[PDB]
Design a protein around this motif. Sequence first.
Motif, mmCIF file in Angstrom:
data_model
loop_
_atom_site.group_PDB
_atom_site.id
_atom_site.type_symbol
_atom_site.label_atom_id
_atom_site.label_comp_id
_atom_site.label_asym_id
_atom_site.label_seq_id
_atom_site.Cartn_x
_atom_site.Cartn_y
_atom_site.Cartn_z
ATOM 1 N N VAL A 1 46.354 -3.344 2.328
ATOM 2 C CA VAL A 1 47.301 -2.741 1.393
ATOM 3 C C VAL A 1 46.610 -1.775 0.438
ATOM 4 C CG1 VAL A 1 48.510 -3.233 -0.748
ATOM 5 C CG2 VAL A 1 49.243 -4.327 1.377
ATOM 6 N N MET A 2 45.506 -2.229 -0.149
ATOM 7 C CA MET A 2 44.707 -1.391 -1.041
ATOM 8 C C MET A 2 44.286 -0.092 -0.371
ATOM 9 S SD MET A 2 42.387 -4.170 -3.228
ATOM 10 C CE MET A 2 41.348 -4.443 -1.802
ATOM 11 N N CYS A 3 43.666 -0.200 0.800
ATOM 12 C CA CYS A 3 43.224 0.987 1.523
ATOM 13 C C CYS A 3 44.355 1.968 1.842
ATOM 14 C CB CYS A 3 42.420 0.615 2.774
ATOM 15 S SG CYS A 3 40.679 0.147 2.424
ATOM 16 N N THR A 4 45.523 1.458 2.239
ATOM 17 C CA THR A 4 46.683 2.321 2.532
ATOM 18 C C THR A 4 47.166 3.026 1.269
ATOM 19 O OG1 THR A 4 47.451 0.778 4.259
ATOM 20 C CG2 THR A 4 48.968 2.511 3.583
ATOM 21 N N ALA A 5 47.153 2.283 0.170
ATOM 22 C CA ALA A 5 47.518 2.816 -1.139
ATOM 23 C C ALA A 5 46.535 3.889 -1.612
ATOM 24 C CB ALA A 5 47.598 1.688 -2.145
ATOM 25 N N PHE A 6 45.251 3.659 -1.352
ATOM 26 C CA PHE A 6 44.199 4.589 -1.739
ATOM 27 C C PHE A 6 44.277 5.908 -0.977
ATOM 28 C CE2 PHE A 6 39.903 6.118 -0.560
ATOM 29 C CZ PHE A 6 39.508 6.617 -1.785
ATOM 30 N N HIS A 7 44.637 5.827 0.296
ATOM 31 C CA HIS A 7 44.698 7.026 1.123
ATOM 32 C C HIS A 7 46.032 7.745 0.923
ATOM 33 C CE1 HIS A 7 40.829 6.520 2.889
ATOM 34 N NE2 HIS A 7 41.140 5.480 3.640
ATOM 35 N N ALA B 1 33.306 3.136 -3.215
ATOM 36 C CA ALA B 1 33.422 1.986 -2.320
ATOM 37 C C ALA B 1 34.633 2.114 -1.377
ATOM 38 C CB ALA B 1 33.478 0.684 -3.117
ATOM 39 N N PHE B 2 35.769 2.563 -1.899
ATOM 40 C CA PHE B 2 36.970 2.696 -1.085
ATOM 41 C C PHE B 2 36.795 3.810 -0.076
ATOM 42 C CE2 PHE B 2 38.966 -0.087 -4.057
ATOM 43 C CZ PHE B 2 40.053 -0.621 -3.400
ATOM 44 N N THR B 3 36.259 4.931 -0.541
ATOM 45 C CA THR B 3 36.039 6.078 0.322
ATOM 46 C C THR B 3 35.188 5.721 1.539
ATOM 47 O OG1 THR B 3 36.271 7.792 -1.395
ATOM 48 C CG2 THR B 3 34.978 8.335 0.562
ATOM 49 N N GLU B 4 34.174 4.889 1.335
ATOM 50 C CA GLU B 4 33.249 4.527 2.410
ATOM 51 C C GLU B 4 33.747 3.389 3.305
ATOM 52 O OE1 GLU B 4 29.420 3.283 1.035
ATOM 53 O OE2 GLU B 4 28.893 2.328 2.936
ATOM 54 N N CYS B 5 34.314 2.352 2.703
ATOM 55 C CA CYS B 5 34.639 1.131 3.433
ATOM 56 C C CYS B 5 35.983 1.167 4.136
ATOM 57 C CB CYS B 5 34.571 -0.065 2.502
ATOM 58 S SG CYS B 5 32.969 -0.179 1.773
ATOM 59 N N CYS B 6 36.908 1.966 3.615
ATOM 60 C CA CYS B 6 38.231 2.077 4.225
ATOM 61 C C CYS B 6 38.161 2.769 5.584
ATOM 62 C CB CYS B 6 39.215 2.787 3.288
ATOM 63 S SG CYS B 6 39.647 1.794 1.821
ATOM 64 N N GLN B 7 36.944 3.131 5.993
ATOM 65 C CA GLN B 7 36.688 3.743 7.294
ATOM 66 C C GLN B 7 35.549 3.048 8.044
ATOM 67 O OE1 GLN B 7 37.097 7.392 4.964
ATOM 68 N NE2 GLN B 7 35.030 7.983 5.608
ATOM 69 N N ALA B 8 35.521 1.721 7.971
ATOM 70 C CA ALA B 8 34.502 0.935 8.656
ATOM 71 C C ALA B 8 35.145 -0.050 9.623
ATOM 72 C CB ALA B 8 33.624 0.199 7.648
ATOM 73 N N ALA B 9 34.343 -0.553 10.562
ATOM 74 C CA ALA B 9 34.799 -1.529 11.547
ATOM 75 C C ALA B 9 35.436 -2.732 10.863
ATOM 76 C CB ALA B 9 33.634 -1.972 12.429
ATOM 77 N N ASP B 10 34.649 -3.410 10.033
ATOM 78 C CA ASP B 10 35.158 -4.497 9.205
ATOM 79 C C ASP B 10 35.260 -3.999 7.764
ATOM 80 O OD1 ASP B 10 35.831 -6.892 7.954
ATOM 81 O OD2 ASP B 10 34.420 -8.078 9.130
ATOM 82 N N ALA C 1 34.712 -6.686 4.889
ATOM 83 C CA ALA C 1 33.327 -7.134 4.830
ATOM 84 C C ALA C 1 32.444 -6.113 4.125
ATOM 85 C CB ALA C 1 32.804 -7.413 6.229
ATOM 86 N N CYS C 2 32.889 -4.867 4.121
ATOM 87 C CA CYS C 2 32.163 -3.782 3.461
ATOM 88 C C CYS C 2 32.610 -3.597 2.002
ATOM 89 C CB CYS C 2 32.343 -2.483 4.265
ATOM 90 S SG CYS C 2 31.995 -0.880 3.434
ATOM 91 N N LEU C 3 33.895 -3.827 1.750
ATOM 92 C CA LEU C 3 34.501 -3.520 0.460
ATOM 93 C C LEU C 3 34.341 -4.637 -0.568
ATOM 94 C CD1 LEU C 3 36.106 -1.448 -1.191
ATOM 95 C CD2 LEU C 3 38.198 -2.275 -0.056
ATOM 96 N N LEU C 4 34.681 -5.865 -0.186
ATOM 97 C CA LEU C 4 34.693 -6.993 -1.119
ATOM 98 C C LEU C 4 33.358 -7.286 -1.835
ATOM 99 C CD1 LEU C 4 36.990 -9.481 0.876
ATOM 100 C CD2 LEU C 4 37.652 -7.821 -0.866
ATOM 101 N N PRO C 5 32.221 -7.096 -1.149
ATOM 102 C CA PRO C 5 30.956 -7.368 -1.847
ATOM 103 C C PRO C 5 30.653 -6.317 -2.904
ATOM 104 C CG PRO C 5 30.677 -7.504 0.531
ATOM 105 C CD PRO C 5 32.017 -6.869 0.288
ATOM 106 N N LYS C 6 31.255 -5.144 -2.755
ATOM 107 C CA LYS C 6 31.057 -4.053 -3.707
ATOM 108 C C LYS C 6 32.020 -4.150 -4.877
ATOM 109 C CE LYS C 6 29.598 -1.117 0.111
ATOM 110 N NZ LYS C 6 28.780 0.118 0.275
ATOM 111 N N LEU C 7 33.229 -4.639 -4.607
ATOM 112 C CA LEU C 7 34.214 -4.864 -5.660
ATOM 113 C C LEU C 7 33.818 -6.065 -6.518
ATOM 114 C CD1 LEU C 7 37.762 -4.280 -4.174
ATOM 115 C CD2 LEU C 7 36.050 -2.630 -4.970
#
Length: 575
Positions: free
Chosen positions: A118-124, A160-169, A172-178
């Motif tokens: 939801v966050m990623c869709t909202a961000f884009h 963090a959103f810019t980078e992780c919202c375009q990763a395989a998992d 797993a990429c976003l939550l440790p940064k948030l």
Amino acid sequence: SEVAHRFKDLGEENFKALVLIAFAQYLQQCPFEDHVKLVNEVTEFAKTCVADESAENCDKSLHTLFGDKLCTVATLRETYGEMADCCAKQEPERNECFLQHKDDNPNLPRLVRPEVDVMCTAFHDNEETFLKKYLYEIARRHPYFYAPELLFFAKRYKAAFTECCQAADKAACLLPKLDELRDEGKASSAKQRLKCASLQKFGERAFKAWAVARLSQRFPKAEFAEVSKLVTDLTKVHTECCHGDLLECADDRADLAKYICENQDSISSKLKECCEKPLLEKSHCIAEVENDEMPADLPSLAADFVESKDVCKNYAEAKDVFLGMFLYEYARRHPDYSVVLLLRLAKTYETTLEKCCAAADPHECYAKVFDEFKPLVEEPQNLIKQNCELFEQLGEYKFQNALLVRYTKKVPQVSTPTLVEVSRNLGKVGSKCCKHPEAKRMPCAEDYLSVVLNQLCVLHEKTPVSDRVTKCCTESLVNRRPCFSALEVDETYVPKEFNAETFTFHADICTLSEKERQIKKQTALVELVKHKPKATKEQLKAVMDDFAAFVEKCCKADDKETCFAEEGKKLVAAS
């Protein structure tokens, strides 16, 4: 005019962000959309002003201008304790009112974050609007957050959103940064809250003493005149930020970073990397750079401050200059002391010159000042050595429980939610500091404790209930931590009456996350201590161990609710 001067210096993007933060902190209950609406108007006005600085109305003050925009969506309030209407006043009274209405604990719902999808869709979808909501929710819940630092967080948040919202998992990429950002923001806000309390409650002289000592530890090589110049500039920055003057605070801060990077030879050798970074990074970096190496062969401080016969004269010529020099000399030689300890020494020294320079033979009277310091130095060392020992055998959760029992006995009138939060935060000192070598433990531990106790003071000031808290909070800023330590058991307290519901079951205590279940058990501990303030270490041990076993037993029972109810009365009975 002044609005154009700050637009040009800061650039439109930071300008808009800073205006949004200021609005959200003055009017913490107004909805997102209204603030966005007013920030946009003010910004386009600002543009007309740099076009013609004598145009329309560009010559008004920033207070006037933002005051007026705010007052078009006021409300005449209702819930502010005992308040008047600010929007009905004239400057600078209007601005004064705004500031004293800042609420340190607003009744706003805890923000739970949606599924990563939801966050990623909202961000884009709407990136501009996604990032402004981030600023707005933080700023209104933390009215004293350090403004230019919030810009830096939000820049990292976007990254963090810019980078992780375009990763395989993604998760797993976003939550440790948030999660890491959230932890950083919490500590950041607590440090700044102590800076504003100092300026506002104890005065400009209190803050400047802190800064002389801190910067002297960090830049040991710099002359005293160079130190003083920095103290003066840093004090202006925090005075404006703490007073709600965010545009100039941000601008003045940028100026200081650049003064500093232009004069590294005269300040410190640790500044190179920091001074190559982009604007926001550079300041964040410089604010946390490591202590430089102390100059080689520094003389003893005895000849100038205790042995000489001109001591009383040099002091009386200008007391704060002489005490400032003393603090500068002692601090730059002691990176191994907490800043609160250094200030305690300087104050002990002052007390002795005031008394001795009025006696018949001052030289004889003050000949042994430095001897008074030894007990003051040793007290914090023993405390920390012992507490870290305890921490290391208990582990974090149980260390927290030990502190919870201690504080609930010291000040039993404090609310349970307040007591649980503060005790948990004090217990994190073990994890943060006990890892360091001994010569690095006291600044880390004792200054952190000072930050957490300030939290206790600002919360309690809003609704007083304990005269023991009031005293330790207001008697002396620098002696706050020694004051609470000397407290033991409040002998005047009437034990809270037994309440059955308070010690009852749930069956849904199962299926609760770790954090939540420990919180739930810690609340129950606070209430048990309020009920029986003189119950011993051994009695309390047996009861907690009985409780832990009761919960383990009833979560795996076939009939869980029946077990909770019936095995509950047995627990209650055993005492």
